[PDB]
Each structure stands twice: as C-alpha cells, then as structure tokens.
Amino acid sequence: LVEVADNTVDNTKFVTSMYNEILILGAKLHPTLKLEEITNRKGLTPLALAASSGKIGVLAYILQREIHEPECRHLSRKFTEWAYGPVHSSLYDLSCIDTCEKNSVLEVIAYSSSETPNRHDMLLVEPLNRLLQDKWDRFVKRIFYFNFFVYCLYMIIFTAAAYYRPVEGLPPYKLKNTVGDYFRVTGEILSVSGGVYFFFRGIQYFLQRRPSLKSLFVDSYSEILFFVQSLFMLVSVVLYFSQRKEYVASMVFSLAMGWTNMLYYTRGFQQMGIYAVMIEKMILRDLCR
Amino acid sequence: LLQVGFTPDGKDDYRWCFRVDEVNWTTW
Amino acid sequence: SYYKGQTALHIAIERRNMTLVTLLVENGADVQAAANGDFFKKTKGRPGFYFGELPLSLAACTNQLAIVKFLLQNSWQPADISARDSVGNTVLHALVEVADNTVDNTKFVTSMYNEILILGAKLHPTLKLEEITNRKGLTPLALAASSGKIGVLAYILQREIHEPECRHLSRKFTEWAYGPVHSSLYDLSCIDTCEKNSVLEVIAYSSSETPNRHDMLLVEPLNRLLQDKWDRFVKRIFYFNFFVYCLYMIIFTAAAYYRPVEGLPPYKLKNTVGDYFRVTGEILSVSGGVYFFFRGIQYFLQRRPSLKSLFVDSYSEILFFVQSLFMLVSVVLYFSQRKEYVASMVFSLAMGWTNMLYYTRGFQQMGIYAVMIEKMILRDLCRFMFVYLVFLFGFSTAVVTLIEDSYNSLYSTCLELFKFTIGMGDLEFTENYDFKAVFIILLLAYVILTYILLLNMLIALMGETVNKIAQESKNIWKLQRAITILDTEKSFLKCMRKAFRSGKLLQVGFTPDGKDDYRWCFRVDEVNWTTW
Amino acid sequence: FMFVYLVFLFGFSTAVVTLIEDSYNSLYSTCLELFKFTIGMGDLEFTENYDFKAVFIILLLAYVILTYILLLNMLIALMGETVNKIAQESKNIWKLQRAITILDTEKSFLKCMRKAFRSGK
Ligand SMILES: C=C(C)[C@]12C[C@@H](C)[C@@]34O[C@](Cc5ccccc5)(O[C@@H]1[C@@H]3C=C(COC(=O)Cc1ccc(O)c(OC)c1)C[C@]1(O)C(=O)C(C)=C[C@@H]41)O2
Numbered sequence: 019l020v021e022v023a024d025n026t027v028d029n030t031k032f033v034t035s036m037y038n039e040i041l042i043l044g045a046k047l048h049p050t051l052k053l054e055e056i057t058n059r060k061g062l063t064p065l066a067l068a069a070s071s072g073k074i075g076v077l078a079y080i081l082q083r084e085i086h087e088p089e090c091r092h093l094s095r096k097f098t099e100w101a102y103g104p105v106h107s108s109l110y111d112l113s114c115i116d117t118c119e120k121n122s123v124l125e126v127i128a129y130s131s132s133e134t135p136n137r138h139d140m141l142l143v144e145p146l147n148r149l150l151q152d153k154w155d156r157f158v159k160r161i162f163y164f165n166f167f168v169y170c171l172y173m174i175i176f177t178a179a180a181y182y183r184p185v186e187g188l189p190p191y192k193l194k195n196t197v198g199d200y201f202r203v204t205g206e207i208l209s210v211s212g213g214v215y216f217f218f219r220g221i222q223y224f225l226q227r228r229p230s231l232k233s234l235f236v237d238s239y240s241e242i243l244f245f246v247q248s249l250f251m252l253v254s255v256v257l258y259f260s261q262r263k264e265y266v267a268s269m270v271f272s273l274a275m276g277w278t279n280m281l282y283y284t285r286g287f288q289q290m291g292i293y294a295v296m297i298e299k300m301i302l303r304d305l306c307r
Numbered sequence: 308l309l310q311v312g313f314t315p316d317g318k319d320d321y322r323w324c325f326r327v328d329e330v331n332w333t334t335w
Numbered sequence: 336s337y338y339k340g341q342t343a344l345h346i347a348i349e350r351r352n353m354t355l356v357t358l359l360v361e362n363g364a365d366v367q368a369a370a371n372g373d374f375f376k377k378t379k380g381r382p383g384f385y386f387g388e389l390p391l392s393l394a395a396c397t398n399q400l401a402i403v404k405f406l407l408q409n410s411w412q413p414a415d416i417s418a419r420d421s422v423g424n425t426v427l428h429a430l431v432e433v434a435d436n437t438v439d440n441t442k443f444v445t446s447m448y449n450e451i452l453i454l455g456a457k458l459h460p461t462l463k464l465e466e467i468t469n470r471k472g473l474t475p476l477a478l479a480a481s482s483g484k485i486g487v488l489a490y491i492l493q494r495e496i497h498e499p500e501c502r503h504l505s506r507k508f509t510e511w512a513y514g515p516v517h518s519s520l521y522d523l524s525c526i527d528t529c530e531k532n533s534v535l536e537v538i539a540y541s542s543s544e545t546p547n548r549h550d551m552l553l554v555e556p557l558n559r560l561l562q563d564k565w566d567r568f569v570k571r572i573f574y575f576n577f578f579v580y581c582l583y584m585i586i587f588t589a590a591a592y593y594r595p596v597e598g599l600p601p602y603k604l605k606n607t608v609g610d611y612f613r614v615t616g617e618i619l620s621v622s623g624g625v626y627f628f629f630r631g632i633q634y635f636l637q638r639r640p641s642l643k644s645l646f647v648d649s650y651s652e653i654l655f656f657v658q659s660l661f662m663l664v665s666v667v668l669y670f671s672q673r674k675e676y677v678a679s680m681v682f683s684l685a686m687g688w689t690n691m692l693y694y695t696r697g698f699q700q701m702g703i704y705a706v707m708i709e710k711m712i713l714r715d716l717c718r719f720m721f722v723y724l725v726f727l728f729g730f731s732t733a734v735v736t737l738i739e740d741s742y743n744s745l746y747s748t749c750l751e752l753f754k755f756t757i758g759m760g761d762l763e764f765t766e767n768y769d770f771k772a773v774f775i776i777l778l779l780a781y782v783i784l785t786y787i788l789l790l791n792m793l794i795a796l797m798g799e800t801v802n803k804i805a806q807e808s809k810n811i812w813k814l815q816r817a818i819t820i821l822d823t824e825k826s827f828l829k830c831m832r833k834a835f836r837s838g839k840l841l842q843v844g845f846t847p848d849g850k851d852d853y854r855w856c857f858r859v860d861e862v863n864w865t866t867w
Numbered sequence: 868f869m870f871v872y873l874v875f876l877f878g879f880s881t882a883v884v885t886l887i888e889d890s891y892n893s894l895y896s897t898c899l900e901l902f903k904f905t906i907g908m909g910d911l912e913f914t915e916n917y918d919f920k921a922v923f924i925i926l927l928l929a930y931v932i933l934t935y936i937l938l939l940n941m942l943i944a945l946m947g948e949t950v951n952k953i954a955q956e957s958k959n960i961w962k963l964q965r966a967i968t969i970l971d972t973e974k975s976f977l978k979c980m981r982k983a984f985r986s987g988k
C-alpha cells in the first residue's frame with residue numbers, strides 16, 4: 019500500500035483511508051500483534067518506506083494518525099490533550115521518529131538522494147518541523163556556533179603560519195631558538211592536526227554513506243570540498259618532509275579553499291544560505307556544461 | 308516519556324511524547 | 336495563574352452553550368470579575384489567545400452576539416460596557432486587535448462593533464465609549480490604525496449610520512446625491528492635530544512592520560486630507576526648503592572650492608572682498624551644520640527609534656546627521672590647528688550634494704531612484720559583502736603567500752584583485768614569479784569565480800530588487816509624501832494653526848442629550864454610476 | 868536618470884578636486900575621469916603622491932561601487948524593462964506608424980488622393 023501510492027490528492031486519500039480500515043480490522047482480529055513493526059528485505063518499516071520513497075501523503079497520514087474510536091486508541095499516533103479554543107494542545111508519539119534504529123523518519127528524509135520529489139516539503143509535516151526547531155533551539159545552536167568559532171580560529175592560525183613561512187633554505191627547517199620560531203612551529207602543528215581531523219572525518223563519512231558516483235557531487239559538495247582541503251594539506255606536509263620547495267604550491271590551494279569554505283557555515287542562517295547554494299548549482303549545472 | 312493509554316492486552320503502555328500547539332479559529 | 340478567575344461560564348461561552356451561560360448568571364454568578372493569566376495575555380512566546388479579560392469581552396470576541404446582548408441587558412447583573420482590564424484594553428480595544436485582516440473576519444468584527452456600539456448608546460447615551468484609551472494611551476481608532484487593522488480603521492473612519500435615532504454615532508454624513516456625484520462630510524474630529532496620537536500621525540510613524548501602511552493611506556478621508564494639505568500650504572514650503580538647501584549647497588561648494596592653501600589653520604582674515612566672502616561662506620556653512628545637528632538630535636529624542644529599525648525607517652535622517660557630524664568635526668579640527676579639516680570637509684560636501692536625492696521624494700516620477708538606492712544599499716550590497724570578502728581575503732592570502740619570494744604587499748594584492756572583480760584588471764603574467772603555473776591557475780580561478788559568477792549573481796539580485804520596487808511606484812511615493820506633509824506641518828506651529836486643517840467647523844446633528852454638537856468637517860465628492 | 872546621476876557626479880567631483888587641490892588637476896578632467904569610471908573605462912592608478920592618499924582612495928572606491936555597479940546596472944535593468952514592455956506588442960506599435968505614414972503620403976500630393984480612388988466604388 020505504501021509504494022502503490024502516487025502522491026496525488028485522490029490516490030493519497032484513498033490509500034490512507036484503506037490503510038486505516040485494514041489496520042483497524044487487523045487490530046480487531048489480532049490485538050496481540052502490531053503489523054507496523056515488520057520490515058522488508060531492506061529492513062525499513064512502512065513508515066520508513068513512505069518517508070524514504072517520497073510518499074508525503076502516507077507519511078503525513080501515519081505521523082499524525084488520530085483515531086477517536088474508544089476501542090481503537092493505542093492505534094492513534096497523535097493525542098489531543100485539550101482544546102480551550104483556537105489553541106488545541108496535542109501530543110505526538112515520536113516512538114520511532116528520532117534515535118529509533120538504523121533507520122528513522124528524520125534520518126531517512128535527511129539522507130535522501132535528491133531524487134525524492136517531496137524532501138523539501140517533507141520536513142513541513144508538523145511533528146518533524148517542531149522537533150527540529152526544538153533541537154536547534156535546545157543544544158544544537160550553541161554547538162554549531164562553537165564549531166564555527168573554532169574553525170574561524172583554525173583559519174586564522176593557518177593563515178598566520180602560512181604568511182610567515184621561512185624563505186631561506188630548503189625544507190625541513192631547523193627550529194630556531196626564539197619565541198617567533200616556537201609560535202611558527204606550533205602553528206604548523208595545529209594546521210596539520212586540523213588536516214588529519216578533516217581527513218578522518220571525510221573518510222568515515224564516505225564509509226558510512228558510500229554515495230553513488232553520479233550523486234557524489236549533487237549531494238556531497240561540501241564534504242568533497244573539506245576532503246579536498248585536507249588532502250592538499252596532507253600532500254603539502256608530505257612534500258615538506260620530502261625536502262622539496264613545492265609544499266607552498268599545495269599550501270596556497272589548501273588555504274584559499276580553507277577560507278572560501280566558511281560559506282559552509284552560512285547554511286546556519288536563513289538569509290545568508292542562498293549565496294552558498296547558488297554558488298553550488300551555478301558551478302555544477304551551468305558552468306560545467 | 309509518559310503513558311497515555313491502555314493496550315488491548317491490558318498492560319499499560321509507556322511511550323515518548325512531544326506536546327505541540329496550533330491556532331485555527333476559522334472553523335469555530 | 337493559568338486558570339486565574341476562569342470559571343465554567345468561560346467554557347460554556349467558548350462552547351457556544353446558549354443555556355449554560357444563561358444559567359451561570361441566573362444562579363447569581365458575577366461577570367464583572369475577570370480572568371488573567373499567561374495563557375490569556377497577548378504573549379507570542381507561549382501559546383495563547385487574547386480575547387480580553389472581561390467575560391463580556393470574551394463573549395463578544397468569540398462571535399456570540401445574542402449572549403453578549405443578553406449579558407448587557409441582564410436584569411441580575413448587566414455587564415459593564417466600559418470596563419477596562421488590567422492592561423487597559425476595554426471591549427472595543429479587544430475587538431480591534433482580535434481582527435486578523437481578512438474579508439470575513441473584518442466584516443464580522445465591524446458588524447459586531449456596530450451592534451455593540453448601538454446597544455451601548457441606547458443604554459448609555461450620556462457616555463461615549465470610543466474616547467477611553469488603554470495603558471498605552473491610544474483609542475480603539477488609534478489602535479486599529481497603529482496595528483495595521485485596515486478593515487477596522489476603514490470602518491470607523493467612514494462609519495455612516497442611517498438610523499434616525501442613531502445619528503451622532505455616524506462619522507461620515509452624506510449631504511446630497513444629485514446623481515453619480517454624492518457630496519459627503521467626514522468628521523475629522525480626531526484625524527489631524529487631535530492629541531499626542533492621531534490616525535495620520537500614527538500611520539506615518541509606523542515601524543514598517545505594519546503590513547497595510549502603504550495601503551492604509553488609500554482610505555478616502557486620509558487621502559483627500561493629505562492631498563488638500565499638499566495643495567494648500569505644504570507645497571510652497573517644501574519648494575522653499577529645497578531652494579534654500581540648494582543655495583546652501585552652492586555656498587558650501589564655493590567656500591570649499593576656494594579654501595586657502597598656504598599655512599596652517601586658522602587663517603587670518605585678509606583685508607579684501609574675496610576674503611570677506613570666504614569667511615562669510617565658512618560661517619554660513621557652519622551655521623547650517625549646527626542647524627542640522629540640532630534637528631537630528633531633536634528627531635532622535637522625539638522618536639527614539641529602536642536600534643534594529645534605526646536604518647530601515649530613518650535612512651535620510653541618519654544621512655543628514657552624518658553630514659552635520661562631519662562638518663562639526665571639520666570645524667573642531669580647524670580650530671585645533673590641524674590641516675586635516677579638508678579630509679572631513681570633502682566627505683561632508685559629497686554627502687551634501689548626494690543628499691538632494693532626499694527632495695526627489697516630492698515628485699511622483701523621480702521618487703523611486705531615491706528609494707532603490709536605499710534598499711539596494713541595505714539589503715543586497717551589505718550582505719553580499721560578507722560573501723565577497725571571504726573570497727577576496729582567502730584568495731589574496733593565497734596569492735601573497737605563494738609569491739612572497741602589484742602583488743608585493745597584501746594591500747596591493749587586495750587592490751589588484753578588487754579590480755579583477757570589477758573588470759579593470761590586467762592578466763599580465765609578465766614578471767618571473769616563482770611557481771608561475773600555480774599563480775596563473777589561482778588568478779584564472781579567481782576571475783571566473785568572482786568576475787563572472789559572483790558579480791553577475793549580485794547584478795541579477797539587484798535587478799530583482801529594482802523590478803520589485805519599480806512596479807508599485809504610487810504606493811512607494813504616497814507614504815513619503817505623507818511623512819513630508821506631517822513633518823512640514825509639525826515644524827511650524829503657526830503653520831498648522833493658520834492652515835485650517837479641517838475644511839470647516841460646523842454643527843450637523845443633535846446629540847441625544849439635547850445639546851447641539853459642533854464638529855469639524857471636510858466635504859468630499861465621488862463618482863459611481865454603475866450602481867444607478 | 869541623468870538628474871539622478873549628475874548630483875552624484877558633481878558632488879563627488881567637487882569633493883575630489885577640493886581634496887587634492889594642493890588627470891585630477893582641473894574640475895573638467897575630474898569630471899571626465901569620473902565619467903569613464905561610471906562607464907567602466909577608468910583606471911585606479913593611485914600612483915602619484917597626492918595629499919591625503921587614504922581619503923582619495925576611499926572616495927574613488929566609494930564612487931566606483933556607487934555608480935559603476937549600483938547606478939549603471941540600475942539604469943540597465945530599467946531600460947531592459949522598457950525594451951521588454953515595448954517589444955511584446957510589436958504589431959500595434961507598427962500599425963499606427965504605418966497609418967500616419969499613409970495619411971501623410973496621401974496629404975502631400977492632392978492629385979495623388981484624387982487619382983488614388985480611396986473608395987472602392
Ligand atoms: C571539488 C570541486 C568542484 C572544486 C574544488 C576547488 C578546486 C574549487 O574549484 C572547483 C572547479 C571550479 C574552478 C573554478 C571555477 C568554478 C569551478 O570547484 C570547486 C571549488 C570552487 C570554489 C567555490 O567553492 C564554493 O562553491 C563555496 C561553497 C559553497 C557551498 C558550500 O556548502 C561549501 O562548502 C564547503 C562551499 C572554491 C575552490 O574550492 C577554491 O577555493 C579554489 C582555490 C578552487 C575552488 O573544483
């Protein structure tokens with residue numbers, strides 16, 4: 019019933035109605051068993067299937083499914099606490115919406131391939147929008163701002179240690195006995211440590227997701243760019259340990275990438291996001307072809 | 308994490324919840 | 336707190352229970368008591384619905400005309416139409432803010448407002464309920480005008496009641512209708528120069544958050560009154576203001592052009608006609624500076640605008656204050672015996688000349704250019720500079736680090752790459768810098784990324800802005816004219832006193848108390864023959 | 868749009884020439900150099916050692932951003948709207964011009980109208 023849906027008002031209404039009827043009848047026949055917990059070969063429930071395949075009608079039905087019938091209450095997903103007037107307090111189940119299993123509605127909508135048609139409008143469904151806003155206001159916001167602040171500091175140190183690179187002799191360079199030399203070597207170490215961190219982050223992301231080659235750039239632009247910056251710094255340090263003057267040619271690439279990559283954090287504001295999105299599409303659709 | 312209903316099997320069910328509110332007065 | 340004072344009467348009223356609400360009062364329940372709580376208060380932080388604290392206010396705001404009528408005429412304890420809650424908003428206030436600016440809701444709220452007004456007048460002809468203000472000290476008319484409730488404002492301004500017993504209630508009086516023409520008389524009792532708040536003075540000084548302010552001035556009496564004011568005395572005062580500022584700019588330019596270049600400031604007044612003219616010009620310039628300084632300070636004290644809306648709604652005032660500031664600093668440094676007065680003086684002068692776009696607000700066709708330049712500098716350019724500077728600084732640190740062994744200093748790299756952004760660069764690739772291929776790759780990437788991608792991105796965004804704020808030119812112009820008229824009227828008290836804002840001061844009806852009422856009026860006419 | 872542009876040009880050029888009265892020697896040459904700045908044919912040399920160099924740089928960078936980028940593209944968008952408006956309805960635009968041409972040609976020569984036999988019959 020989930021995949022037979024075609025995302026039209028008539029078909030969605032019909033499929034949801036008959037889904038309700040079959041669910042009620044099965045519950046009447048077999049109250050002991052619950053049919054919504056059984057997964058297919060891919061190991062995802064009908065709720066997860068509807069969320070993943072873009073079936074916005076079925077997902078909207080299941081998420082806020084309210085059954086008023088007294089004998090059928092455990093079936094209801096959303097409970098209406100009270101309604102004094104225009105306000106109507108409601109309680110949503112959230113039983114398998116966040117941190118539920120290897121698959122969940124949020125974790126599946128977020129990690130779509132961009133082929134899904136309704137992913138942009140899928141997050142508009144009441145419980146998901148409210149839950150995401152609550153998460154953002156609760157603890158995610160300050161962690162994001164701390165992440166942005168630390169990367170801003172890392173870019174400042176990377177820029178300063180790149181600006182004052184010694185110009186006399188061939189690499190490596192003996193650690194001169196001075197405060198300035200100590201600061202320069204500390205800055206180099208901080209830069210390379212950031213490089214290793216970003217390298218492992220990128221590798222583990224690519225192992226987890228394992229994106230298809232065609233959709234490697236449509237949906238992982240920023241991850242590709244952070245991996246490329248880390249790669250260039252890694253090659254630079256390798257060539258600096260290999261006693262060649264050609265570490266700077268890779269280092270400038272790494273640094274300009276590093277600075278233009280703070281457009282990744284413009285994703286956190288409502289007004290400033292589009293500039294970071296335009297630059298992406300305009301470089302992949304138009305310019306490339 | 309509250310229990311808001313009773314299962315047909317007679318055992319109380321405890322489930323997570325997330326209270327929300329909305330405004331719609333055009334329907335009276 | 337949450338339920339403070341809340342009783343089953345409130346639920347029955349909100350549940351549209353005809354009898355239960357009746358039974359509560361029949362038993363002896365008193366409605367004069369009110370329920371106040373965080374849920375009832377008008378707070379956006381938490382869910383709530385403000386219908387007023389008075390139970391009569393609750394019943395009225397809940398669309399129950401029969402029940403409120405019964406309560407008002409209830410024998411046991413009639414509800415007090417004049418009751419005011421802790422906030423101050425009486426029933427009329429509550430009806431005003433409960434409006435949501437929709438055809439159905441506006442029609443309903445206006446209709447029930449009329450019914451309650453007529454009923455109260457019947458009960459208490461002696462008292463008039465529309466003159467009582469809330470804690471903020473503004474009437475329901477002023478509340479509707481301020482909060483953007485265009486439906487309620489349009490209702491109250493042109494409220495015509497044909498009923499013979501209810502005539503003093505009517506705001507607009509129709510003198511006669513020979514045909515398509517229908518002479519009308521509007522009250523104007525509290526529309527201009529009424530109190531510390533008035534409909535015009537409140538619409539003009541909105542925060543731009545109000546949705547209908549541009550379309551609020553379209554209401555008949557206000558548009559007619561503003562046009563009459565503009566045609567009567569405001570127009571020549573505006574043109575005299577523009578002429579005097581044009582002369583002040585000419586003198587400021589001439590005395591700035593012929594500044595002495597020998598020695599350090601101050602300069603001894605040479606015995607000549609030219610020197611006398613130069614010192615006279617300097618004095619005229621500084622006097623203009625003091626005038627603009629005090630004008631700006633008094634404006635900022637009167638309005639006291641919020642920091643966020645300091646630039647959205649006071650662009651021109653900020654610019655005039657900044658010009659005055661630069662001249663003041665220039666004169667201070669000229670009295671401090673430093674040659675650095677000219678550096679501030681040129682800023683002051685270019686500001687002065689480009690500020691005559693303020694007076695382009697007075698023409699219909701020329702206004703938009705002064706409006707575009709504003710939005711395009713505050714919305715687009717400001718936030719696009721963040722996007723551009725990460726690019727410029729990243730690529731310039733990159734470039735200067737590459738060839739540290741035109742592009743010598745970080746400043747010169749910044750300048751050369753800015754000219755690359757705006758199409759005035761030259762890709763010479765002549766001098767033999769180290770790592771030439773990497774240098775070429777960097778700057779070609781930079782040109783394609785900024786000159787082609789980013790610059791045209793900005794150009795398309797600004798074109799969208801221009802397209803957006805060029806279609807609706809009339810609305811853009813009319814509000815600027817309204818603010819100009821209000822400020823000109825307020826500048827000179829005798830100007831308003833002898834302007835005779837109202838068309839006439841006539842008595843057109845008799846009050847229920849039997850004493851003739853004399854009120855201001857402003858005759859208007861209109862044409863509509865499709866209705867026969 | 869020339870009214871809007873000339874306040875900018877004259878204010879900024881009086882400003883520039885007053886600053887460095889101690890290419891940019893005469894007010895005429897300031898006007899010409901800044902007009903080429905408006906239409907993208909200027910050069911920000913910043914070479915000769917004028918007094919108050921930082922203020923000079925700030926003035927001309929402000930001028931370029933304000934006129935070359937903001938104002939010129941404002942005008943270009945406005946003219947594009949004009950072209951868009953009067954290019955959609957080409958047939959109407961043409962037919963009236965043809966009508967006036969026909970009327971004037973007919974009126975120019977009286978014998979032309981006399982022997983033209985305006986009416987079919
Ligand atoms: C992986 C890819 C596509 C990419 C890596 C480098 C080589 C890149 O050139 C490109 C190809 C290119 C080059 C020049 C013009 C257009 C495209 O585009 C980016 C890439 C293109 C630019 C612009 O990058 C952006 O779009 C900013 C951005 C937008 C949204 C984001 O979420 C984001 O996250 C990091 C970054 C920056 C560079 O990385 C950079 O700083 C320099 C010196 C090279 C640019 O290759």
Ligand SMILES: C=C(C)[C@]12C[C@@H](C)[C@@]34O[C@](Cc5ccccc5)(O[C@@H]1[C@@H]3C=C(COC(=O)Cc1ccc(O)c(OC)c1)C[C@]1(O)C(=O)C(C)=C[C@@H]41)O2
Binds near residue numbers: 653657
């Ligand atoms: C208070 C603000 C915003 C402002 C003051 C000065 C510094 C200003 O640069 C800005 C920032 C700026 C600079 C360069 C390009 C864009 C923006 O914009 C104006 C300000 C921007 C310009 C353009 O001003 C205008 O928009 C004209 C104008 C339009 C509508 C008006 O109602 C108006 O009333 C006075 C003026 C003129 C300057 O004041 C000027 O003449 C010079 C030399 C500096 C310009 O700062």
